[PDB]
Amino acid sequence: IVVLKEGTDASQGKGQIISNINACVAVQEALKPTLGPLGSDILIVTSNQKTTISNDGATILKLLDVVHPAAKTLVDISRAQDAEVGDGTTSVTILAGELMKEAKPFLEEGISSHLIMKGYRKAVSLAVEKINELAVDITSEKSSGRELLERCARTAMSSKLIHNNADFFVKMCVDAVLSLDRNDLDDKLIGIKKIPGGAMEESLFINGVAFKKTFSYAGFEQQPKKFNNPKILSLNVELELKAEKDNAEVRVEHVEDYQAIVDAEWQLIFEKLRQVEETGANIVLSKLPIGDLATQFFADRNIFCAGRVSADDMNRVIQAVGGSIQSTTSDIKPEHLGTCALFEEMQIGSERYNLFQGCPQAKTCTLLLRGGAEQVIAEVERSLHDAIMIVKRALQNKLIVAGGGATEMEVSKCLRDYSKTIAGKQQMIINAFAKALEVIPRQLCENAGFDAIEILNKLRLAHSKGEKWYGVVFETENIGDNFAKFVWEPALVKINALNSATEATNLILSVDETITNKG
Amino acid sequence: QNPNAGLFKQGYNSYSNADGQIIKSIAAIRELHQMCLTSMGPCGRNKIIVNHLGKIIITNDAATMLRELDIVHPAVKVLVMATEQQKIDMGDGTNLVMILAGELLNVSEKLISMGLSAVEIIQGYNMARKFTLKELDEMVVGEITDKNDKNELLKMIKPVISSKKYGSEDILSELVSEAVSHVLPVAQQAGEIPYFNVDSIRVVKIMGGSLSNSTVIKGMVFNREPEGHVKSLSEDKKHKVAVFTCPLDIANTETKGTVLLHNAQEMLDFSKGEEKQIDAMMKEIADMGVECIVAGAGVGELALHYLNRYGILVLKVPSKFELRRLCRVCGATPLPRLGAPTPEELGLVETVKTMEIGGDRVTVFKQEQGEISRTSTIILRGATQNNLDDIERAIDDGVAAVKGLMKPSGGKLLPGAGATEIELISRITKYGERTPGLLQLAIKQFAVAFEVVPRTLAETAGLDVNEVLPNLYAAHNVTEPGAVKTDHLYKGVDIDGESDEGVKDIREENIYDMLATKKFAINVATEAATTVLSIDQIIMAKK
Amino acid sequence: KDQGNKKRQHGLEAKKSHILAARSVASIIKTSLGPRGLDKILISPDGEITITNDGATILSQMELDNEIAKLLVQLSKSQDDEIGDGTTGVVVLASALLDQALELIQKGIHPIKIANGFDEAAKLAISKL
């Protein structure tokens, strides 16, 4: 009659560890096509009904929301990969899951997982030491300031639809990173706006901030769109004649009183409307719509206004001209105003776009992209995001290691020799760790269409011949040196990946039982 | 067609004891016993606990598991209550009670299958318990002088960090021992007033850095910023602090006293009223020597203006739980009214400043070598927020383990790492064959039940049980030509991650178990095993 | 959260299901492509019955949960603003490339080589026109 769990499912034993292994393979198998710049993209449909397609492991695992506890640990460690580094969230989960696959036959042989986890901790400790030996300090050495940024951005943009126009896109990509303080570089500070229509090579770089120009209200052919030093005013409240929401009940029996209450509704609005002119600002920006009466009164005094501007764009305006948002039109102070070097409304893409240009106080920028289709430009923007992260980390981190299979093979190469000196179960565990490091160069060839059998075996040949820098060429299929091909990643990525993947692996291998309470 | 007999109560399922119901009760414990076998030890395993609120929890401590599990069966429920007996009176040894009491019932199945009466089984363990407690008093090797030195505290804390957080054992030991020595006074020949409360050590954490960058503060740290324009106090000694329950504003009535507004003429008088009254009250506070005012409630705008001209640091603590421990450092008392900072309610603080911890600015509360503090703070740093929270749970259990070092005979120690359990095997079996009667059956099996502790640590460490265990038995069996026995009391169970021909000694790493922890664990494990053996049947009713 | 109501198509059986699903949606408007093409009866959610061969109307009136077919709707949505008369022609042409891609998958050719193959195929055909 009595029950221990009161109907709360709890399972233990070696079968629970196997169930944790199958969960790590399921998460790995989903991220395998998303590994590498040429890797395939995953189709994810969230319960929010927003269909997204991306290859970035961070965004992928955040939108899946896997309830499985052992599989959720691989998601939590991927968010740590997005925190400590921010790049490589796809490879850290695949490598951690591969450690679960290589530890599966050891569980059937009767080898305890604690000796397996202890073997990885000694393997990573030797692996990080080899990465420090593979860390090459380079700043001005055999490279200039311009060639270091350009030649590294061309490789990230290679094998893409932008390959032919890459010469123009590297110039805007390098100038985008140099437009910000090299001490603190944030990808969020670089704005990117997609412009439908037009040629890809005609894209422009804006030093200031731009937005969509969502103003739908009539009164056009006025309010000149080109200003030299406009005074930008950030507004909150609603200046439209006929208001959005509220109202009032007024009972009057006279005809002159009918026109009076209509003029009263006008005078109450015109009061705060005239206070905008008393500030003497040429640009009026508000997150709420600016009605026909307001845009007409601004047209007579030659004041430009745009309503219903996104909040994300208004925050960049504050970071551009150094202004501030004031709630009312009365108390507006002079320091809340701001000014740019040039203001123009561009018709590029058969659509009107307001832009601020030449802001000396701007901590952010905006880069416009053009193309024949909105989906193609989105691929250009994401291929640019991969190029920005390489250019950004090049200045922030001067210690680099050869990527694209180069470093992955050298770490796996030496640990096979280090395992010869160690005897016992730890020898087969280190050999399994070095074998688990072979999944990274493998999936890079499988996702790009290259043959995994020939290229990997040929890579194991020349790399064993005394040259440590041989990677996998992503352009023309062959083995080659990525140090010459300029495939570069900082040493902190390879160190934090081996530390985070083994950590998440050690947390899952240490779980004998999963207790889930229902309620 | 088939009638029913034996159940006269109501429609139920009747379980007679002739079917081995007492064995089925132990079998239900064996399901839970195997859960604790992967817990104890630094090589133990962590269990994923999904809370009923949809929260993921991964921890080694089994007391959290039993708290999240809802128990019905009595033999398991008594072990849960027995775990609370070990959890309330001590902050360590919870896995010792669950594993030992489970094995005592496992070896009892051989006596039950033999036909030995349950009462005669209980009588055997009770006589063997008195033989064990007599040995546990003689198993004591060293004892701490209560010098409270840092190195002396490391000897106690080092084995406590083990079995919970491994690899941080040496790093966390320097962090915990420093915080204990701050709130632990050095005194002797006084047993009237208890010392070292659990609340004496506060633990905070922040993302970033690692355990190497962690620091220990001699006082409590507040997360809130110095709202007032005075960021920190001066270098003058003994700054007076004031804790006010009433918010900082114009003087009001203790009962109600809500300010109402009617006409704009009153608002002009309310402004000037708050200007003169606050400036009059805050000036008298500064004249009495109080440079810091702790406000448990809100602070007005004019209250900030006048205190900044007097150089008084404004510090707000809306949490009443932090104010309770705050009174244990300086000694200040909260005042329900405002304007009368009685010097008996005023405290003393050496230093109040603002430090940057993990990128965020925090205002601390601390002292240097004066007006001894009963509350300390451990600032933890780490890259993983989940693992950093588990370190906090390991430190909090380490603080409650130092509580066992107080007056109730906590200085004496016994060899740990499975060294004590092996010697008790030879001592009890010596009493088994020596004591005549049927008790020799249960007494000898009582010593065999201690073989689970060395075997559990060996199974979790991946070591061969067919090797370490028989070598550990021969390690304590020697022939000494004399009364005093020698050679080796120090052979334990081996923790190796890098092998080692044979086993090591306790004297090398100084890893031991406390007497107050071991002696209390034996009493709880036997009473829990006695309770299960005392139940030969169950009775239930319709809910 | 909510492990149920989540399906995953990956690897072998995913590529075959994607092409056949896009073929069924394309086979709808194949017979509607031309000057002689056949009409269809479309029923609005309010109950109004309309008969038209316009592809922009048929693809918009059709409510489908297929994500691969939603990409076909986005294909006709972007070209409708640019042109508007190639609605039914671009989907049949794209599905014809998918039908030939499915045959290449069965031959052992990776989808990346197929995508790079159709890319050089368009650049060559544009130069000829």
SS3 B294: strand
Q: Which of A73, A76, A515 lies at the smallest CB-CB distance from B50?
A: A515
Task: Give the Cα separation of B330 and B348 in Å (integer).
Answer: 5
Give the A window 338-377 contacts with C, CB below 8 Å. 373-375
Nearest 5°: the CA angle A355, A357, A361 is 120
Count the Cβ atoms, other than its own, within 10 Å of residue A163. 14
Q: Which of B50, B70, B497 lies at the smallest CB-CB distance from A69?
A: B50
Q: Which of C3, C67, C112 lies at the smallest CB-CB distance from A38?
A: C112
SS3 A516: strand
Which residue, among B208, B37, B195, B25, has the nearest Cα to B109 in the 3D structure? Answer: B25
> Does A314 share its domain with A194?
no
Is the Cβ pair A115, B65 closer than 8 Å?
no
Task: Give the Cα separation of B446 and C53 in Å (integer).
Answer: 90
Task: Give the Cα separation of B396 and B378 in Å (integer).
Answer: 11
> Does B111 share its domain with B158?
no
Is the Cβ pair A4, B69 closer than 8 Å?
yes
> Does B227 share its domain with B365?
yes
| SS (HEC) of chain C | CCCCCCCCCCCHHHHHHHHHHHHHHHHHHHCCCCCCCCCEEEECCCCCEEEECCHHHHHHHCCCCCHHHHHHHHHHHHHHHHCCCCHHHHHHHHHHHHHHHHHHHHCCCCHHHHHHHHHHHHHHHHHHC
SS3 A478: coil
CATH of the domain at A258: 3.50.7.10
Sheet holding A283-286, edge to edge: A232-235, A283-286, A304-306
- Strands B46-50 and B347-349, by their bridges, are unpaired
Is the Cβ pair A84, B69 closer than 8 Å?
no
Tell me if chain C has a CB within 8 Å of the CB of A65. yes
| SS (HEC) of B249-277 | CCCCCCCCCCCCCCCHHHHHHHHHHHHHH
CATH of the domain at B349: 3.50.7.10
> Does B291 share its domain with B338?
yes
DSSP code, position B449? G
DSSP code, position B19? G
SS3 B51: coil
Point out which residues pair with B362 in neighbouring strands. Answer: B355
Residue type at A103?
Answer: A
> Does B91 share its domain with B125?
yes
> Does A201 share its domain with A214?
no
- Residue B14 makes CB contacts below 8 A (sequence gap 6+) with B6, B7
> Does B444 share its domain with B314?
no
Domain boundary among B355, B384, B411: B411
Q: Which single residue is written with the structure tokens 């400043």?
A: B353
Count the Cβ atoms, other than its own, within 10 Å of residue A328. 11
> Does B261 share its domain with B365?
yes
Q: DSSP per residue over A354-397, as a string?
A: EEEE--TT-S-EEEEEEES-HHHHHHHHHHHHHHHHHHHHHHH-
> Does A337 share its domain with A226?
yes
Nearest 5°: the CA angle A192, A196, A198 is 105
Contacts by B10-15, CB closer than 8 A, 24 or more apart: B10/B542, B12/A1, B12/B540, B13/A1, B15/A1, B15/B538
> Does B399 share its domain with B416?
no
> Does B226 share its domain with B362?
yes
Point out which residues pair with B335 in neighbouring strands. Answer: B244
Task: Give the Cα separation of B96 and B396 in Å (integer).
Answer: 19
Q: Which of A27, A47, A161, A455 has the most C C-beta neighbours within 10 Å, making it the best mutation to test the interface with C? A: A47
Q: How far is CA A147 from CA A390, A444, C29, in A?
A: 14, 27, 53
B197 φ/ψ angles, rounded to the nearest 5 degrees:
-75, 160
Q: Under a CB-based contact definition with an 8 Å cutoff, are residues B220 and B365 in contact?
A: yes
DSSP code, position A29? H
Q: Which of A4, A80, A515 lies at the smallest CB-CB distance from B384?
A: A80
How was it solved? cryo-EM
Q: Which single residue is written with the structure tokens 């291998």?
A: A509
Tell me if chain B has a CB within 8 Å of the CB of A361. no
Q: DSSP per residue over B475-534, as a string?
A: HS----SSSS--S-S-B-----SS--SS--BHHHHT-EEEHHHHHHHHHHHHHHHHHHHH
CATH of the domain at B393: 3.30.260.10
Task: Give the Cα separation of B122 and B534 in Å (integer).
Answer: 8
Task: Give the Cα separation of B289 and B349 in Å (integer).
Answer: 12
Q: Which single residue is written with the structure tokens 């303080």?
A: A181
Task: Give the Cα separation of A140 and A157 in Å (integer).
Answer: 23
| Helices H / strands E in chain B, number of each | 18, 14
Domain hosting A356: range is 210-395
DSSP code, position A334? G
Q: DSSP per residue over A399-427, as a string?
A: EEEETTTHHHHHHHHHHHHHHHHS-SHHH
* Biggest CA-to-CA distance, chain C: 54
Give the A window 13-72 contacts with B, CB below 8 Å. 69-70, 72
| Resolution of the structure, angstroms | 4.6
Sheet holding A399-402, edge to edge: A136-137, A399-402, A488-490
Is the Cβ pair C2, A65 closer than 8 Å?
yes
CATH of the domain at A161: 3.30.260.10
Task: Give the Cα separation of C80 and C85 in Å (integer).
Answer: 7
Task: Give the Cα separation of B49 and B83 in Å (integer).
Answer: 18
- Residue A103 makes CB contacts below 8 A (sequence gap 6+) with A21, A113, A116, A432, A505, A509
Task: Give the Cα separation of A353 and A211 in Å (integer).
Answer: 6
SS3 B297: coil
CA A143 to chain centre: 28
List CB contacts (< 8 A) between A2 and chain B: 72-74, 538, 540
**Tokens for B129?**
């318990």
> Does A256 share its domain with A345?
yes
C52: exposed, middle or buried (Cβ count in 10 Å: 0-12, 13-18, 19+): middle
Contacts by A101-107, CB closer than 8 A, 24 or more apart: A101/A21, A101/A24, A101/A25, A101/A28, A101/A436, A102/A432, A102/A433, A102/A435, A102/A436, A103/A21, A103/A432, A103/A505, A103/A509, A104/A18, A104/A21, A106/A428, A106/A429, A106/A432, A107/A14, A107/A17, A107/A18, A107/A21
Domain hosting B214: range is 144-218+371-411
Q: How far is CA B486 from CA B259, B469, B475, in A?
A: 83, 21, 12
- Residue B72 makes CB contacts below 8 A (sequence gap 6+) with A2, A3, A4, A6
- Residue B77 makes CB contacts below 8 A (sequence gap 6+) with B71
CATH of the domain at B532: 1.10.560.10
Q: How far is B461 from chain A (nearest CA, A)?
A: 7
- Total number of domains in chain B: 3
> Does A365 share its domain with A225?
yes
3-state helix, strand, coil in chain B (%, to 5): 45, 15, 40
> Does B400 share its domain with B477?
no
- Residue A331 makes CB contacts below 8 A (sequence gap 6+) with none
Task: Give the Cα separation of C102 and C3 in Å (integer).
Answer: 31
A286: exposed, middle or buried (Cβ count in 10 Å: 0-12, 13-18, 19+): buried
> Does B427 share its domain with B379?
no
> Does A196 share its domain with A244?
no
- Residue A193 makes CB contacts below 8 A (sequence gap 6+) with A210, A211, A212, A353, A366, A367, A368, A369
Task: Give the Cα separation of B392 and B386 in Å (integer).
Answer: 10
> Does A367 share its domain with A326?
yes
> Does A175 share its domain with A214?
no
- Strands A479-481 and A470-472, by their bridges, are antiparallel
- Residue A284 makes CB contacts below 8 A (sequence gap 6+) with A233, A235, A276, A290, A294, A298, A303, A304, A305, A306
User: Which segments of B310-361 does DSSP mark as H helices, in order?
Assistant: 320-326
> Does B106 share its domain with B159?
no
> Does B418 share its domain with B406?
no
List CB contacts (< 8 A) between A447 and chain C: 112
